[PDB]
Amino acid sequence: TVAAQSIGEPSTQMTLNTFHYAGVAEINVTLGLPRIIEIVDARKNPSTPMMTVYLDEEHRYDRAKA
Amino acid sequence: KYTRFEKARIIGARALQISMGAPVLIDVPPGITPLEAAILEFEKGVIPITVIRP
Amino acid sequence: KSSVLARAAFEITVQHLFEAAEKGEVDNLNGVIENVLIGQPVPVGTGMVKLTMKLPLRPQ
Amino acid sequence: EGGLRFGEMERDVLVGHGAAMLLIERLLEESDKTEVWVCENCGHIALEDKRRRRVYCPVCGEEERISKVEMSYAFKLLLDELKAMVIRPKLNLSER
Amino acid sequence: GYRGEKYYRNLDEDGLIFPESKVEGKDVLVGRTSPPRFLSLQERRETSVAVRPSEKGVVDKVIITETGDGTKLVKVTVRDLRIPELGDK
Amino acid sequence: IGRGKLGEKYITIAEAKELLLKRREEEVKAGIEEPLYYEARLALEHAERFAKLPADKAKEAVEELMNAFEWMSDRIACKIVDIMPEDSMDLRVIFAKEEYQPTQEEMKQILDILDK
Amino acid sequence: MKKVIGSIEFGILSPQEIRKMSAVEVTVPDTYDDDGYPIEGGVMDKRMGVIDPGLRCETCGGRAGECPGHFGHIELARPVIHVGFAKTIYRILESTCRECGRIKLTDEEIEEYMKKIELARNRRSEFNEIIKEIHKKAKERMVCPHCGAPQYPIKFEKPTIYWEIRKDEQGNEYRHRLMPTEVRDWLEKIPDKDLPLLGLDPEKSRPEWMVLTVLPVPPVTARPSITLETGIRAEDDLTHKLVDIIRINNRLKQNIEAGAPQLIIEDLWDLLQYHVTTYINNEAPGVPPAKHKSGRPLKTLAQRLKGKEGRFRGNLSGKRVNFSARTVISPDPMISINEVGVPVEVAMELTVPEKVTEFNIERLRKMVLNGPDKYPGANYVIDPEGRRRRIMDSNKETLANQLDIGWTVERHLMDGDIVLFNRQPSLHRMSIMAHRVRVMPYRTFRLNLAVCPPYNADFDGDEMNLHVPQTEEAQAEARILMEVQNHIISPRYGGPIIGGIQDHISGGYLLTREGAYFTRDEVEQMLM
Amino acid sequence: MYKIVTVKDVVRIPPTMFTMDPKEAAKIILRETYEGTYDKDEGVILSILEVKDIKDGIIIPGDGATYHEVVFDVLVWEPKIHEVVEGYVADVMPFGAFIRIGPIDGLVHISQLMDDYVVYDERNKQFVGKEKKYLLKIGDLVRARIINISAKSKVIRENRIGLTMRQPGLGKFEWIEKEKKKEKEEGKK
Ligand SMILES: [Mg+2]
Ligand SMILES: [Zn+2]
Ligand SMILES: [Zn+2]
Ligand SMILES: [Zn+2]
């Protein structure tokens, strides 16, 4: 019960509109309370799927090779 | 040693026993309430109730 | 959750109740919500402590 | 002269504090509580007759084993509502 | 259903409260009896209209009228002074 | 019966006459008006009606009856002590309830075991 | 002596159980006569209990507030399908043979699936998956393996309509409808040996019990009529629906006895089925809900057990309580953080029962002498026998002298008492804490300012509730577990939750800033 | 029949008797719980002789008292069907004679005393001899086989025991002596 309340209580302080900004280097993704609801409900397919791909040692530090 | 749940349970049992007519095991100031009498008995170390732990 | 009453109190009560009637499910009242519904101490916190005492108590 | 609502969120707060006896005090004595006759042979609630000063179980005709049970009145109403449908909730008693 | 004689202290013989008389909680404003209920018999239920249980003030005016069906209708207004205190918004 | 009965032992009417007298003495030493509570004073009258046979020697006769033959149960033994039979008809009748009937030579020997 | 409920086992009521547990059979579709007494044999027959004052229930004596209630029963003219079990009935029908009633499975496959089921079927999801697999397997066989007979497909039409797609001459089906009596006869001949394969239980339930022929009647105390201010009895929705059901049943019985045409009997049967399915659940899919005289939808048994205002969430998980008070809050920095200011008006209304002992006799005697009007007084005394006496001005000294060991006094609140202090919504566990009572003249609760953040409260019109524990164990729990000074550190992040806010921080900065200096009088006064 | 049995049970020691030793306080509590009680499967409970062993007390929530498991022995007079009972007739009443057999009183119906036609006195209200002239008195102690036992309730009331006399070997000691004389005469002839 303490864990359930410690998760629920801050959820009244998060935002809904997120940021909605691109900034070239960033991809728009859902954030705030809807993201937490998605994670807890374990949706089969998230609204904004995204992956973070790490390059191997080769091409990792070179911009053109990346 | 004691968890706060055990302490609360012991004090609650002692207070009810004292209220129902059990004698107090330590001298108390006049006019005190049974709950405070049980709390006094407790911090004075005179507790006749023990807790079962597996 | 194994308890019928715990699931019933959450959502879609009638479907759970009728399904439990069909299956002949048995609720052992091992949880918190069912015990609160009955009106007997819950098995958490002070509700799980067990006490004993030596009877021949003599005042000091 | 109504009473204040003691919401289920308050009950969850009480559980989170671990105060079981405070919870039972708030939820039974202050609001509703009653004693019923339960026939442990078949689980059905027995009938107490104030004419004969006698307790007996109508559904199975048992008078030997009729134990006293303490429960909320609202739960008895819930049991009656379930028995209003074809639901049959059997009650298994235990000591202590 | 007859409540205490204390609560009929401020009534007139016609069953209506005297204006400018100070009242307290659950004091009877209009005394009225109703036909009995068959569970008794040869009785009259007490159905007086009384002040709200926690309110207090002074009776300001009493009005006697006739409804759309000719039945008597009585309206009583109670005024209460409210000096500012702690908790007022 | 209280939850979980365990044990059983049959005793003579004289074997409890003295116990009922014990209740009589402790209750009066406690100052209770009745020498012993209801259903026990009347039972004491019932005991003293034919409590002439000594209790200890009643148990002695009982144990000798066990040693005499194995079919005998202590209840039957104390019953035999507390009847004091005189002729065959007596034991035939008192055993007529029992599945087993007593032999007449068994009569003659339990006559010796009975003594007074 | 006293036993507790150890477990609850559910099931389905058999007609024999309903008949035996009932107290009376209902035959008259009316509640009250002209004068106001219950009509003999009506839906408000006194056999089920008494709700009107000055009436004794002949079943168990009692009074309006004493008689608990007794169940009635209605003998339905013809069986009807229970709406809660209709989907299950469809699941069963298309998985068993029409002739022998056996499960349409092969014996070795039955053995394999019985072996599978016994492997911890208590897990509901796995049991459901296994039963779904069995249903899918039994769906796709046109011919029974146990006996030689063709099996026609069955179409389920909501809410309780079953069609049988059976062929005819020139190879054309006519979608025969299955009457409830035919369905009950089909279900009845199912053997118990394969009931676990269908997800049922041979003892707690039976397939033929799901089609009900006798309908239990709830007790009168479960259907309380309200005497409206106009003097007209306002019947509960359930009572009205029962009246309709009895009227339809009586009409059906009369028509059957009179040899009515088949179509009329079918229409009456459908009407009775509709009335029953609305009474059990007025929000059942595929039906127009029954409506009150005012046009509002009726509330029935299924409605009482659902929703935020329903039984489970409105009267079981939460309820209204006694010994509680509510008023606005106002700041008070002069009291300790573990103390709450209580109005004197509230203190003389709420009471804390206390037992008379050798160490508190004189104080209780003084309070009893003070009466129920002086502030440190009392309102009731309870003798050791258990009788309740109200303290009045003519009883003060007599009851004070009668007072002795073993008595109970319902004294007014005092300084140092423990109470529960709550703000809604109860978002997290430190929304409710225990405070020490400190009596105050005015009519607002006084709360220390450092305790605001846990309650998320500001003094702009907020109202907060107060509760008084009534038993010694509850008071001990509140005193030991719920003290305010225990919860300085928040459990969410291990940091303080109670602390200085606003003016506290500003004054601290003003005091400790560089260049701040104070004189003799200022230092002495501030330290004092 | 008098019989001593041992039974375990749980005892609710109230806080008022916490000071005294557990055994005697138990004893009194057992006395109050069942001193004047007659069991269906045991008989009329007479006396809790002594508590053999007392266990510790478990503090159940709500009550606050101590519950101790105990083992004790109690002597119980157990009536048995088809049994001779050597009691004396307490009173007589024209459906049946009442013979006192212990804590309960046994009933000897008029049509079940003696093979002779059903007869019972009215002026003396004890018994009238039709053909046998075979008088049973209120102070005389008799033995009688039992036909039935009325196990109804534990309040030692509404319970009666049927005792037959028609069978041989029962009755007033005088007529038993007369039957013994007849047996002696037949054995001597
Ligand atoms: Mg606010
Ligand atoms: Zn039963
Ligand atoms: Zn009733
Ligand atoms: Zn077949």
Q: What is the 3-state secondary structure (H, E, C) of C1-57?
A: CCCHHHHHCCCCHHHHHHHHHHHCCEECCCCCHHHHHHCCCCCCHHHHCEEEECCCC
Distance from CA of G310 to the nearest CA of B (A): 34
Question: In 10 A of CB H5, how many CB atoms?
Answer: 20
Interior angle at CA A30, CA A27 and CA A32, nearest 5:
125
Q: In what order do the strands lie in the sheet with G176-177?
A: G154-157, G161-164, G176-177
Residue type, G485: Q
Residues G19, G23, G24: CA angle, nearest 5 degrees: 85
Count of residues in chain C: 60
Beta partners for G339?
Answer: G436
Cβ proximity of G277 and D47 under 8 Å: no
- Between helix F74-83 and helix F13-29 the angle, nearest 10°, is 80
The pair phi, psi for residue E57, each rounded to 5°, is 165, -155
> Of the candidates F39, F86, F81, F82, which has an alpha carbon nearest to the alpha carbon of residue F64?
F81
| Residue reference for tokens 């080769």 | A58
For residue H131, give Cα distances in angstroms to G185, H83, H99, H114, H117.
70, 28, 23, 11, 8
Distance CA(D84)–CA(D74), nearest Å, equals 15
The experimental resolution of this structure, in angstroms, equals 3.4
Distance CA G183, CA F14 (A): 73
Helix (H/G/I), strand (E/B), else coil: G346: helix
Contact F9, F74 (CB under 8 A): yes
Give Cα H182 distance to the centre of its chain.
33
**DSSP string over G94-130:** TTB-SSS--BSS-HHHHHHHHHHHHS-TTSHHHHHHH
| Three-state secondary structure call for residue G305 | coil
Give the helix ranges, DSSP H, for chain F: 13-29, 41-49, 55-68, 74-83, 88-96, 104-114
- Spatial CA neighbour of B12 closest among D19, H10, G406, G408: D19
Q: Name the helix (H) or strand (E) containing G74.
A: strand G72-81
- Identify the H or E element spanning H9: strand H2-13
Long-range contacts of D29-33 (CB under 8 A, 24+ apart): D29/G470, D29/G471, D30/G321, D30/G322, D30/G323, D30/G324, D30/G470, D31/D3, D31/D6, D31/D72, D31/G319, D31/G320, D31/G321, D31/G322, D32/D72, D32/D73, D32/D74, D32/G319, D33/C39, D33/D70, D33/D71, D33/D72, D33/D73
Question: Residues F112, F61: contact at Cβ < 8 Å?
Answer: no
CB-neighbour burial class of residue G322 (10 A; exposed 0-12, middle 13-18, buried 19+): middle
Looking at residue G395, the DSSP 8-state letter turns out to be T
Beta bridge partners of G12: D87
CB contact under 8 A, H167 and F50: no
CA G454 – CA G441 distance, rounded (Å) = 26
* Residue G81: closest CA among G165, G183, G175, G13: G183
Chains B+C touching (3+ CB pairs under 8 Å):
yes
Q: What is the DSSP letter of D26?
A: I
In the reported structure, the alpha carbon of residue G114 is separated from the centroid of ligand 4 by a whole-number distance in angstroms of 19
> What backbone torsions phi and psi does residue G112 show, to the nearest 5 degrees?
-60, -45
Q: What are residue A26's phi and psi, to 5 degrees?
A: -125, 150
Distance separating the N- and C-terminal Cα atoms of chain H:
39
Tell whether G427 is within 8 A of chain A (Cβ).
yes
Instruction: Give residue H168's identity as a one-letter amino acid code.
Output: P
3-state secondary structure of E86: coil
Which token pair is G180? 């409830």
H or E stretch including G255? Answer: helix G237-257
Reported as half-sphere exposure (CB side, CA atoms, 13 A), residue A31 has a value of 10
Consult the annotation and say whether G452 binds a ligand.
Answer: no
- Tell me which chain H residues have a C-beta less than 8 angstroms from the C-beta of C43: none
Q: Please check whether residue G302 is in contact with residue C14, taking contact to mean a CB–CB distance below 8 angstroms.
A: yes
By C-alpha distance, which of H175, C58, G503 is closest to B24? Answer: C58
- Bond from prior residue into H22 cis (ω within 30 degrees of 0): no
CB pairs C-G closer than 8 Å: 78
C-alpha distances in Å from residue F14, one per residue of F57, H1, H6, H76, H86: 10, 11, 20, 14, 13
What distances in angstroms separate CA G489 from CA G68, G485, G523, one per listed residue?
Answer: 49, 9, 32
Under an 8 A CB cutoff, do D15 and A1 touch? Answer: yes
Give the G window 255-314 contacts with B, CB below 8 Å. Answer: none
CA dihedral sign of residues G274, G278, G280, G285: positive
Length of chain F equals 116
CA distance F85 to F96: 14
Q: At what angle do helices B4-20 and G472-481 cross, to 10 degrees?
A: 150
The 3-state DSSP class for residue G216 equals: strand
Strands (E), chain E: 22-23, 28-30, 33-34, 45-46, 49-50, 57-66, 72-79
Residue G16 neighbours by CB distance under 10 Å: 11
In our burial notation (b when 16+ CB lie closer than 10 A, e otherwise), range F35-59 reads bbeebbebbbebbeebbebbbeebb
Please provide the DSSP assignment of B14-26 as one string: HHHHHHHTPPPSS
Q: List all residues 6 or more positions away from H138 whose beta carbon is below 8 Å from its beta carbon.
A: H88, H89, H90, H91, H92, H126
Report how far residue H35's alpha carbon sits from residue E28's, in angstroms, rounded to the nearest whole number: 59
Is the Cβ of H64 closer than 8 Å to some Cβ of chain D?
Answer: no
Are G76 and D86 within 8 A, CB to CB? no
Q: Quote the CA–CA distance of H51 and G247 in Å, as a whole number.
A: 66
Whether residue B12 and residue D21 make contact (CB cut-off 8 A), yes or no, is yes
D60 is in an annotated binding site: yes
Q: How many residues does chain G have?
A: 528
Are G435 and G479 contacting, i.e. CB atoms less than 8 angstroms apart? no
According to the entry, how was the structure determined?
A: cryo-EM
- Are the CB atoms for G147 and G141 separated by under 8 Å? no
Q: What is D36-68 written as a DSSP string?
A: EEEETTT-PBPEEETTTTEEE-TTT---S-EEE
DSSP structure class, residue H7? E
Taking each helix axis as running N to C, give the angle between helix G107-118 and helix G124-139, from 0 to 180 degrees, rounded to the nearest 10: 170
Query: B4 CB near a chain G CB, below 8 Å?
Result: yes
Which residues from H are below 8 Å from D21, CB to CB? Answer: 61
Query: H/E element holding G176?
Result: strand G176-177
Beta bridge mates, G341 = G438, G446
**Are residues G243 and G130 in contact, defined by beta-carbon separation less than 8 angstroms?**
no
Contact G1/H62, CB-based, under 8 Å? no
Q: Which uninterrupted H or E stretch holds A3?
A: helix A2-8
Q: Where do the DSSP E strands lie in chain B?
A: 49-52
CA–CA gap between residue G46 and residue G220 (Å, rounded): 8
- Coil, helix or strand for H96? strand
Q: D23 and C36: CB-CB below 8 Å?
A: yes
Cα Dmax for chain G: 118
CA G415, CA G342: separation in Å to the nearest integer? 10
Judge contact between G109 and G288, C-beta under 8 A: no
Counted across chains B and G, CB pairs separated by less than 8 A come out at 62
Which amino acid is located at G411 in the chain? R
* C-alpha atoms less than 13 angstroms from C-alpha of H25 in its C-beta half-sphere: 22
Assess whether chains E and H touch, using the rule of 3 or more C-beta pairs within 8 angstroms. Answer: no
Please say whether the dihedral angle defined by the alpha carbons of residues D10, G473, D24 and G477, taken in this order, is positive or negative: positive
Rounded CA separation H124/H114 (Å)? 18
Q: Which of D11, D22, D73 to mutate to test the interface with G (most CBs of G within 10 A)?
A: D22
Tell me the residue ranges of DSSP E strands in G441-487. Answer: 445-447, 463-467
* C-alpha–C-alpha distance, residues G479 and G468, integer Å: 12
Say if residue H32 is exposed, middle or buried (CB neighbours under 10 Å; 0-12, 13-18, 19+). exposed
Place of tokens 């157990």: H78
Q: What letters, b where the CB count within 10 A reaches 16 and e where it falls short, cover E30-64?
A: bbeeeeebeeeeeeeeeebeebeeeeeeebeebee
Spatial CB neighbours of G61, under 8 Å, sequence gap ≥ 6? D49, D50, D51, G67
Contact D18 B5 (CB under 8 A): yes
Residue of C55, C57, C60 to mutate when probing chain H, most H C-beta within 10 A: C55
Amino acid at F48: E
| Selection from H130, H133, H144, H151 nearest residue H96 by Cα | H144
Q: What are the residues whose beta carbons fall under 8 Å from the beta carbon of G20, sequence distance 6 or more?
A: D58, D59, D60
Structure tokens, G151 = 């099996």
Q: How far does CA G72 lie from the centroid of its chain?
A: 22
Residue whose token pair is 């009560």: C13
Distance between CA F45 and CA F17 in Å, rounded? 9
Which two tokens mark B14? 């002692």
Report the distance separating Cα G190 and Cα G171, nearest Å. Answer: 30
Does D42 show up as a binding residue in the annotation?
Answer: yes
Pick from G480, G483, G487 the residue to mutate for testing the B interface (most B CBs within 10 Å). G480
Q: What are phi and psi of E50, to 5 degrees?
A: -125, 160
Do G457 and G445 form a contact (C-beta atoms < 8 A)?
no
- C-alpha G5/C-alpha H67 separation (Å) is 20
